[PDB]
Amino acid sequence: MREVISIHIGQAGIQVGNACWELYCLEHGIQPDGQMPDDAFNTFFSETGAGKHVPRCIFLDLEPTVVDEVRTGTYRQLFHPEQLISGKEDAANNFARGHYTIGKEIVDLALDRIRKLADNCTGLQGFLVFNAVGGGTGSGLGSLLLERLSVDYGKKSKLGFTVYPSPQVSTAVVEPYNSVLSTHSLLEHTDVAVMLDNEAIYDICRRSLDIERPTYTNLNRLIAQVISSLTASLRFDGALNVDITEFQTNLVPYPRIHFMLSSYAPIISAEKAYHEQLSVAEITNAAFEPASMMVKCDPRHGKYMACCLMYRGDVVPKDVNASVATIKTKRTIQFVDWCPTGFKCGINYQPPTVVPGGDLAKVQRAVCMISNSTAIGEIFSRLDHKFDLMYAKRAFVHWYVGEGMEEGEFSEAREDLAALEKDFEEVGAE
Amino acid sequence: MREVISIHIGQAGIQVGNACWELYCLEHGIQPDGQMPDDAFNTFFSETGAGKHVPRCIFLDLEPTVVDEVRTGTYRQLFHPEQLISGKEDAANNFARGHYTIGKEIVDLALDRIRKLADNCTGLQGFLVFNAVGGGTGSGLGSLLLERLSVDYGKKSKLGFTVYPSPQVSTAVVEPYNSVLSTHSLLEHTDVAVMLDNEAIYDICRRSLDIERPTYTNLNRLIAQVISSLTASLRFDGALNVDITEFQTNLVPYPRIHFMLSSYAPIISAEKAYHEQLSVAEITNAAFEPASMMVKCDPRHGKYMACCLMYRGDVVPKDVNASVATIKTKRTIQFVDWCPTGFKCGINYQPPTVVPGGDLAKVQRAVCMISNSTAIGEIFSRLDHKFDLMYAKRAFVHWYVGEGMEEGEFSEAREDLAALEKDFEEVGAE
Amino acid sequence: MREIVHIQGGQCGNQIGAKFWEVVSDEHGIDPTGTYHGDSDLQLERINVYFNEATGGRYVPRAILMDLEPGTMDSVRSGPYGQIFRPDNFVFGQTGAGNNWAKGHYTEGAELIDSVLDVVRKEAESCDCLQGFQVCHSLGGGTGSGMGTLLISKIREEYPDRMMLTFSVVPSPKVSDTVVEPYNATLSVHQLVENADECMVLDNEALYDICFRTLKLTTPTFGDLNHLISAVMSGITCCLRFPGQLNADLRKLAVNLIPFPRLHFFMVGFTPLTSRGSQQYRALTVPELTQQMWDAKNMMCAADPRHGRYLTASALFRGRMSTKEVDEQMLNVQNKNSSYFVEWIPNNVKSSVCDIPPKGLKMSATFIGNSTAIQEMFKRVSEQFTAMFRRKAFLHWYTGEGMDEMEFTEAESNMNDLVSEYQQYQDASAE
Amino acid sequence: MREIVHIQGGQCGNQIGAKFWEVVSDEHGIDPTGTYHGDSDLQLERINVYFNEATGGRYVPRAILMDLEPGTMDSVRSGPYGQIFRPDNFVFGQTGAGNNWAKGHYTEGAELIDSVLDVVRKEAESCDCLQGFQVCHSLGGGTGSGMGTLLISKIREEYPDRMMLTFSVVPSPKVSDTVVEPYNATLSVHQLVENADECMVLDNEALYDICFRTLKLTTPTFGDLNHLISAVMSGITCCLRFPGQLNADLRKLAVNLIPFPRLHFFMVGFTPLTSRGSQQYRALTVPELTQQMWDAKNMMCAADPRHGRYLTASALFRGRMSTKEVDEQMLNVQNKNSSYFVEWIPNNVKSSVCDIPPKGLKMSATFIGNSTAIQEMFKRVSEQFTAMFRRKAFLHWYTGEGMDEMEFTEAESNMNDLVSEYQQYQDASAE
Amino acid sequence: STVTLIQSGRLVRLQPHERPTDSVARETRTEDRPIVDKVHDKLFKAHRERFVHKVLRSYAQDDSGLLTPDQLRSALDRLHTGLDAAEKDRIVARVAPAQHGKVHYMDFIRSLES
Ligand SMILES: Nc1nc2c(ncn2[C@@H]2O[C@H](COP(=O)(O)OP(=O)(O)OP(=O)(O)O)[C@@H](O)[C@H]2O)c(=O)[nH]1
Ligand SMILES: Nc1nc2c(ncn2[C@@H]2O[C@H](COP(=O)(O)OP(=O)(O)OP(=O)(O)O)[C@@H](O)[C@H]2O)c(=O)[nH]1
Ligand SMILES: Nc1nc2c(ncn2[C@@H]2O[C@H](COP(=O)(O)OP(=O)(O)O)[C@@H](O)[C@H]2O)c(=O)[nH]1
Ligand SMILES: Nc1nc2c(ncn2[C@@H]2O[C@H](COP(=O)(O)OP(=O)(O)O)[C@@H](O)[C@H]2O)c(=O)[nH]1
């Protein structure tokens, strides 16, 4: 009844989808074979007559390796074989390759399977698109799929949990290029975009989980916990329910401004757990700590516009109200003048389930804070000069041209990002 | 509800805090794990929802070894991990190191945790600061933290249980230097400063406890018993309850004159126990004996200004009045002309609890005599010559200068202890 | 399922290809008779990248062996892994090119090039999807350089979009093997600039330096040099063949390495190269691997990176490692040596991670540097070419094969323009 | 978590450092292969002070070995605990310094000092917190003294605030080994006064006297003297590594010991040093250890304390003892020998207690005394240096290594100024 | 409960009956490869080696490192590998006792290190 269709595009999307679906299977008791030994799974799983539960997900990639690892691993009997869609040639970190030449047939088949999945959903809260801003497959094919979804499905809420390049550390070279292109693409298609940075999540793991060697599996586990906290209000009942439609209506002040900082709390290992109270006020403060942001962007530079809090576990409205009052009275946290409330609290009675073999401990309470704040303009400012530093010399431009782009596409994307900067400045200022 | 925040700075502060918290746990029945099998613990412990009682204490030190001994000791699950604060480099018996260069970040974090702790207290009777005048951590960091507390918390009563260097025996060489500096500091911040000397407590253990080889554990156990006698009226009820706020007004004639001799009675081992009557009159006379002073300062040279008696156990008020009347009629005990009353009696119905493995015996009665007397200026007179003898040659001055200190500070500290000398002379005078 | 067609050209190219195919057969558990004997499913995951299955369990390399004299591939067949190759893929002439690029490209290469393209097309059509062709050969030799460049041109004409990867053994600076090395290298570089999408420069003297200083071998035969080259050629494509935490194909490396089409020449290095004595004493850590990667001695090209500036640099790591450690290490390297990195590129490092290390190694890493230091290599070769061309020494050998004199001038002009590109982007300032 | 970087210099310094690391590994239960076999949590509690954890369970000492000839560290590596050290920490030249301080500080130390500082910086940057550096070497030798002074100067420039501790084996009074010992010592003392923050003075003949009069040994090789020095070097820092009832770090010892910065030379002693015969006949009491500690023979320094005056004296005890006992004993010593103690310092005792005694001994005590007695040692070194320097014997080698002849006058003047400091603070009166 | 094996880029999807199921947890087979990868990541990537060594030594009362297989299972549970009982049994069976549970922590760590 409250079905949400999950799309995982690119290596990053698929690798966070592995963690997400492991988390969902653990949360709903679904064994990796597919079936579990009510109807809270309907948001993410559709049950067949035999009793087997198949997720409403779609793994899209132009490279066979990442999807084939899923086909070979433990969750080989869980996902639908045709739902796993694999290309033949990788996009090679080329937005043009993933958006104009290789991505066409792949996204056509993706729309076909998405249509089949939506036909199996009585309701449809929306789409959860998990991709990687900064890679040809994630950026190009993800943008193409988002455009097609906006064309056909229309008003369905598409929540894009994008992973943007980190400020200083990075793994690709043309990452600013395809990041700017994908940002121009998804500024006008996704309904709520959530920013995530590998540097920020590495910092979170190093400080809070005390992992000196964090890895992609740990990052994806944290992201999966964030998304599970987001969707907990759809699957488990609780006081102050939040809906997928309600996230926008409480978070997106203007259509252009829909990019979101995310912070989960508490992030504590098994060793350091049960050593502090971890009460509601403390975990709310931890969530509002700038160091707990999953984006390398200091909120102190900007001003919060909206803050949606998702509480999980033993949380009471007295406690959430007191915590939010303390946060408001805190002088470090600064809100815009035109949003006096700026807070959307939603509680859920289901504590976050702990993945065995993960570093997170079993905490009876959790807070997931998703904030629309004008500080996020800083990361766009960083990418805006990282892109144009190369684009002044037109470095790697011939690569993008070879697969059917023009200098005009780069110019328009960069102009749109500058306009987004101007819009952020305008909304932040009085 | 009548909470007192405990602070322990430096090796001596933390090591007397070990005995103090062992004693408080034994007195309130709190097991080392954190929980006990009404509301008398609230003064020293804050109970959590799980039933675990965590002490309202803060262990501050720039050296990691002493705090790590606590973190690994039996009391590892009792104390709060963040409450135990450990530095990186020791003050190296340098007041400048502990007050100007290394101590800044540590004291900032200390005030952070102190603010958190004081938030969890409905009321706040005061602070109990246990440190070591005669070492950089105790002197420098302790003085800095006392300044911080005096400025921000303000009118909360801070009781500084300071240990000054003994007249002849000592373990440090720059001990006169940093002792003069820290006395110069704490003359203006602490509200009641309790004087202690290792030589005096060693003599007490040698004659009364018959310990031919006294050690720091025994000294700290005696100090802890004294402090428990001080705080018994906050946690247990009894006739003539005395409050932390009552101590100063009953004991401090003038703002600068707030240094106080402390003397416990009885100090008897088990073998000598139950072999003398230990009546109220006899234990009072023992408390007023010169040898029972925990500071190497003969009371006979000076005159008592005020004497506050804390009785614990089966004590009847006529017995306290008869004993104190005999004390007044005694010729050896001499009061100032301007304080005819000079006595602050306070009884309590809880006999002193005995630490297993200690030397103190289970005595049904106990007296802690805390006296303001003009005699105590003699110890400052000793240090005032110990200081200037070295300062004439400016030995070890470069060490203090290197960490941001000046000749003016040494000169001003010496001036201020000379001022304290004149103040004690003037209070003694008619 | 992204197939790579291997081509070996000339004596040096054939020997390097034999070593490389023996290394790959070891890594995929293929015995010299072609049967799989690995006892690991990871070996057969992506064996199609390099091999085709026979009627039985036999696996035949997708390799094409080239020569104008049969002796070199007679030795190749007599080698330990000479029987894996399909005998139809051995294409030989009868009179070898006398270290004559003209003979290997125009006169004697013309007859054999038809058969070479037939074999290449037959191998490429069997591919489900074709990543591209990798050609191992040596600049400064007749049949190798000439035939390899001719085949590269033909394959570029037939399959423009497919990748072209080249492993060229550029003549060594200090000691020259043959006299006509500057002529052959100058003529071959001109073809490789226009045709080859991706090129790796190897120098025998640099390999001697690395095998004598790091491996500490005192009498290294050509087998050791071919072994190091084969390790590099395996590590460059291990991401195609094994699952990776952050995988990256040849096209991805080319996109992240090549800023402008003409600047596709790279110097490569492979880590960890450890002496037998210090094998136990060395610690396998990501910082140690990165430190050995960025050392100038680790480069298999004669030019040292210190003189030039790194335009780009890819690092393909192998092993179960922390992506945080990898990214932090190379970010720290960039920050420390920012003088040696180009300013107008915010990030000059392309990190790739594969989960399967080479056999016996806990961790490894191949480094591919696009740096302006290769400018001095080209400059030296041009200094030799000009000295010989001014007096037309040995020029009649090329002239009598039906090559115009103007072709030498055109090749040298192109090579000098490439040098100008490298210098201009070395000294190019942002804004 | 307060680390110490150990450095060994010269043959004597390298041997003493090897013995010291053997003793420390014995104390921490580290077998020569690096694995922990101590069966005590406290041993691994602070093992990071001296060691770093390797890829496995192995622990590598934070030691750096310097030499100009390879034979000494070849013997060190062949020794019982030679395999614990990292091979990258062995820095050697090829031609040893011919007992020439000029050769070890100017000509032959100049090239190797870059590698030495590189290894030192690598070891120091890995430390979370750095207490400082300790350099073990011998005055009166070429490579030892020369490279020790040069490295100490370099490290002082790099890390001015970090502690610098030196264990210098001053040439013996009566029987001298090499001819140029007074020259080398005079040149080294000038550098040690300016750079090293804290310095221990040791004598081979003083060690021989103590080992024949207290230990009553028959044939004491250099190994026994090195063992005694190693015991002192462990006992000086056992407070950092083990919990103590009254702990004191190196900076605390320096602050309480050094009245004026240039007077930072100290004589050390270890107790209880008992003969094998009188092990049962002696009784381990704190008064016994104090009586042995204040004996003139217990000093490892040739200068006898009786002639001079004790400026300061620290005593670091190890074992379960009464702080009252220790304090009373040392106060009684000061009162009894008040004539030998400086008047204008009311307390000349810095007593520290650690809770962990050395293995085999129930309790121990190390003594570090700053007394004006070492004035006579510096005076004797001057009486030799002047005797040779008045005729410039043996001087032409030093002149030929590129150090000016005025430098000898500089060094002698500075050392004589230090002598003047010791004498005037010996005869200084209060008020 | 079929197992999908990718041979030369295509999915074989072999039946469970054909697989021998050696019950050793060998990383060579892709069936047990994720298990070994998880154990390696938790032991080395996530946990500090000093902490792992301390945990393993704690169960070794003899201080010689000789740990029983049951003690190894308890150590893995304490280290939070997250494996099932059968997976932990296979990871323990990766090493073989010498005389009677004589496998030591250094041997086990060497087995799971590379
Ligand atoms: N947070 C996070 N980011 C990841 C993870 N895996 C990959 N990424 C990011 O994803 C980016 C590349 O993803 P993809 O575009 O899908 O890579 P691909 O599958 O080879 O496709 P192309 O790069 O377009 O050719 C990299 O820059 C990484 O920063 C992951 O597990 N967690
Ligand atoms: N009564 C008593 N006094 C002690 C004890 N431990 C140390 N002291 C005294 O405390 C003084 C020094 O205290 P601290 O400043 O804390 O020593 P530290 O922790 O090493 O810090 P710094 O000396 O400043 O480097 C010494 O002179 C001792 O006289 C103890 O256990 N009991
Ligand atoms: N690394 C390596 N280089 C070789 C080998 N054989 C020849 N070379 C080098 O390759 C260069 C060119 O020779 P080559 O191309 O094989 O001659 P061709 O076959 O007649 O064209 C010579 O300068 C040799 O130094 C080999 O087995 N390994
Ligand atoms: N205690 C001790 N002293 C030594 C040892 N070997 C040499 N010495 C003394 O150290 C002094 C200086 O020698 P040294 O500086 O090491 O010579 P160098 O290495 O050539 O500079 C000599 O006079 C020796 O008497 C040893 O093993 N132990």
| DSSP letter, residue B316 | -
- Residues of E within 8 A of A64 (CB-CB) are 9
Residues D311 and A162: their CA atoms lie apart, in Å, by 70
Structure tokens at B374: 């003009």
C283, C320 contact by CB (below 8 A): no
Pairwise CA distance, residues C315 & C256, whole Å: 11
The token duo for C231 is 């390790």
Which are the contacts of E37, defined by CB distance < 8 A and separation ≥ 6? C320, C355, E27
Stretch (H or E) spanning B88: none
Instruction: From chain E, pick out residues whose CB is under 8 angstroms from the CB of A73.
Output: 34
Residue B134 in contact with ligand 2 by CB distance below 6 A = yes
CA angle D208, D211, D213 (to 5 degrees): 105
Tell me if residue B264 falls in helix, strand or coil.
strand
CB contact (8 A) between residue A277 and residue B82: no
Residue type, D2: R
| The amino acid at C93 | G
β A84-86/A157-164 pair status: unpaired
Residues ≥6 apart with Cβ < 8 Å to D67: D9, D10, D11, D14, D73, D91, D92, D93, D96, D143
**How close D317 comes to chain E (CA, Å)?**
29
Q: Which string of b and e fits A222-246 if b means at least 16 CB within 10 Å?
A: bbbbbbbbbbbbbbbebebebbbeb
Question: Is the CB of A211 inside 8 Å of chain E's CB atoms?
Answer: yes
Concatenated DSSP letters of C87-149: GGGEEE-SSPP-S-HHIIIIIHHHHHHHHHHHHHHHHHHT-SEEEEEEEEEETT-HHHHHHHH
Burial of C268 (0-12, 13-18, 19+ CB in 10 A): buried
DSSP B319-365: HHHHHHHHHHH-SSS-B-TT-S--EEEEEES-PPP--TT-S----SE
Joined tokens for residue B331: 């010729």
Calpha distance E36→E30 (Å, rounded): 10
Cα C262 to Cα C424: distance, rounded to the nearest angstrom? 13
User: D86: distance to nearest CA of chain C, Å?
Assistant: 7
User: How many Å apart are CA D263 and CA D265, to the nearest integer?
Assistant: 6
Q: In sequence order, which residues have a C-beta less than 8 Å from that of residue E67 and are 6 or more positions away?
A: E56, E59, E60, E75, E101, E103, E104, E105, E108
Neighbouring-strand partners of residue B310: B346, B368
Residue of D nearest to C284 (CA): D55
d(Cα B241, Cα B249) in Å, to the nearest integer?
Answer: 15
SS3 for A75-93 is HHCCCCCCCEEECCCCCCC
Distance CA A287, CA A366 (A): 9
Atom of ligand 4 nearest to the CA of D140: 12
Subunits with at least 3 CB pairs below 8 A relative to chain A?
A: B, C, E
Name the residue among C128, C127, C144 with its Cα closest to residue C136. Answer: C144
Q: What's the rounded Cα separation, in Å, for the pair C44 and E7?
A: 5
D186 lines ligand 4 (CB under 6 A): no
Give strand pairing partners of B311.
Answer: B347, B367
Across the interface, whether the CB atoms of C254 and A386 are under 8 A apart is answered no
The residue type at B39: D
CA dihedral in degrees (A228, A230, A234, A239; nearest 10)?
A: 110
Structure tokens of B9? 């700075």
CB neighbourhood size of B314 (10 A): 12
Which residue's C-alpha comes closest to atom 5 of ligand 1?
Answer: A12
The number of CA neighbours under 13 Å toward the Cβ of A34 is: 19
Handedness of CA E102, E105, E106, E108 (dihedral sign): positive
| Overall resolution, Å | 3.5
Cβ of B54 under 8 Å from any chain D Cβ? no
Burial class of residue E12, CB neighbours in 10 A (0-12, 13-18, 19+): middle
3-class DSSP state of B53? strand
D87/C contact by beta carbon, under 8 A: yes
CA D59 to chain centre: 24
Output the six-digit token pair for C357.
Answer: 């290390």
At D365 the three-state DSSP class reads: strand
Six-digit token pair at D290?
A: 């104090």
Helix (H, G, I), strand (E, B) or coil at D308: coil
Residue A387 and residue A133 in contact, taking contact as beta carbons nearer than 8 Å: no
Alpha-carbon span B54 to B73, nearest angstrom? 16
Whether residues D55 and C284 touch (CB distance < 8 A) is answered with: yes
Per the residue annotation, which of A47, A246, A282, A289 is the catalytic one?
Answer: A246
Which amino acid is located at C295 in the chain? D
Cα dihedral B283, B287, B291, B297 in deg (nearest 10):
180
Contact list, D350 vs chain B (CB under 8 Å): 171-173
Dist. CA D138 → ligand 4 center (Å): 6
Residue partners of E74: CB distance under 8 A and separation at least 6:
E59
Q: Supply the residue whose CA is at minimum distance from atom 23 of ligand 4.
A: D177
Helix, strand or coil for residue A161?
Answer: strand
From the CA of C397, how far away is ligand 3's center (Å)? 20
Residues with Cβ < 8 Å from C280, sequence gap 6 or more? none
Residue A406 is among the residues annotated as catalytic for this protein: no
Concatenated DSSP letters of D63-82: EEEEESSHHHHHHHHHSTT-
Q: Which of residues 350-379 of D touch E (CB under 8 A)?
A: none
Q: What is the DSSP letter of B98?
A: I
CB B248, CB B370: distance < 8 Å: no
Q: Which of D240, D239, D208, D236 lies closest to D224, judged by CA? A: D208
Distance CA B422, CA B425 (A): 5
Burial (CB < 10 A; 0-12, 13-18, 19+), residue B234, is buried
DSSP notation for A225-277: HHHHHHHHHHHS--SS---HHHHHHHH-SSSS--EEEEEEE----TTTTTSS-
Neighbours of chain E (3+ CB pairs under 8 A): A, C, D
Distance from CA of E59 to the nearest CA of C (A): 28
Q: List the single best residue of C46, C131, C252 to mutate versus A (max A Cβ within 10 A).
A: C252
Q: With H, G, I as helix, E, B as strand and everything else as coil, classify residue A377.
A: helix
Packing angle of the helix pair B280-287, B317-329 (nearest 10 deg): 50
Give the CA distances from residue A166 to residues A176, A375, A380, D223, in Å, rounded to whole numbers and listed in that order. 10, 15, 11, 58
Cα–Cα distances in Å, from A244 out to A192, A284, B44, C170, C339? Answer: 10, 22, 48, 62, 50
Q: What is the DSSP string of C274-310?
A: --STTTTTS---HHHHHHHHT-GGG-SSSS-TTTS-E
- Identity at C234, one-letter amino acid code: S
Our CA-based measurement puts residue E79 at a distance from the nearest CA of chain C, in whole angstroms, of 19
Looking at beta carbons, which residues of chain D come within 8 Å of E63? Answer: 37, 39
* Opening angle at CA D334, ends D331 and D340, nearest 5: 170
Q: Nearest-5° angle of CA B170, CA B174, CA B178?
A: 100
Q: What is the CB neighbour count within 10 angstroms for residue E102?
A: 14
The amino acid that residue C239 corresponds to is C
Pair B265, B367: CB distance under 8 Å:
yes
Check CB contact of E41 with chain C, cutoff 8 Å.
yes
- How far from chain centre, in Å, is Cα B4? 14
CA distance C293 to C301: 13
Looking only at the bridges linking them, the beta strands covering A57-61 and A4-9 are: parallel
Is D332 annotated in a binding site? The answer is no
Signed CA dihedral, A141, A142, A147, A148: sign only: positive
Phi and psi at D165, nearest 5°, equal -120, 135
Q: Residue E37: which of E96, E87, E107, E105 has the closest Cα?
A: E87
- Residue E37 contacts residue E65 (beta carbons within 8 Å): no
> Nearest residue CA, atom 6 of ligand 1?
A12
3-state percent breakdown (helix, strand, coil) of chain C, nearest 5? 45, 20, 35
Q: How was this structure determined?
A: cryo-EM
Contact E50 D56 (CB under 8 A): no
DSSP-H helix ranges across D195-246: 204-213, 222-241
A216-235 helix and A10-28 helix, angle to the nearest 10 degrees: 50
Q: B260 CA to middle of ligand 2, Å?
A: 20
